[PDB]
Amino acid sequence: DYASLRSLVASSGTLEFITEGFTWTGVTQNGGSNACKRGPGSGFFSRLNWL
Amino acid sequence: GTGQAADLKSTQAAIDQINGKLNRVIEKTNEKFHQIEKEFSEVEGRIQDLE
Numbered sequence: 001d002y003a004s005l006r007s008l009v010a011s012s013g014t015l016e017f018i019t020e021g022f023t024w025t026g027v028t029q030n031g032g033s034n035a036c037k038r039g040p041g042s043g044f045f046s047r048l049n050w051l
Numbered sequence: 052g053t054g055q056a057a058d059l060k061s062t063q064a065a066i067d068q069i070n071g072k073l074n075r076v077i078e079k080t081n082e083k084f085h086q087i088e089k090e091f092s093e094v095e096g097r098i099q100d101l102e
């Protein structure tokens with residue numbers, strides 16, 4: 001449902017992202033990949049956390 | 052002396068014209084029953100934006 005998401009974000013008019021304190025116990029946070037090279041080396045979706 | 056009197060036929064001719072269009076404007080109002088929803092509760096996207 002890519003069309004429905006693109007419309008509601010467009011009607012919102014704000015990409016404001018408030019980071020919250022999620023307690024991920026027992027899993028490794030902040031995974032990176034080769035295709036998502038950000039800056040020097042591997043990077044991540046800025047608003048997503050890979051467990 | 053001085054008198055005043057109205058002409059019935061000319062006044063009636065004007066009233067017959069206006070009453071004719073007054074009927075033309077309020078005649079047979081559309082009758083609609085089960086339609087679509089127009090006020091919505093939460094975001095839905097593609098279908099909601101079209102509704």
Ligand SMILES: *[C@@H]1O[C@H](CO)[C@@H](O)[C@H](O)[C@H]1NC(C)=O
Nearest residue numbers: 014015016017018019046047
């Ligand atoms: C974006 O969201 C809010 C702006 O109100 C702020 O608290 C947060 O630090 C911002 N972060 C970035 C990366 O711009």
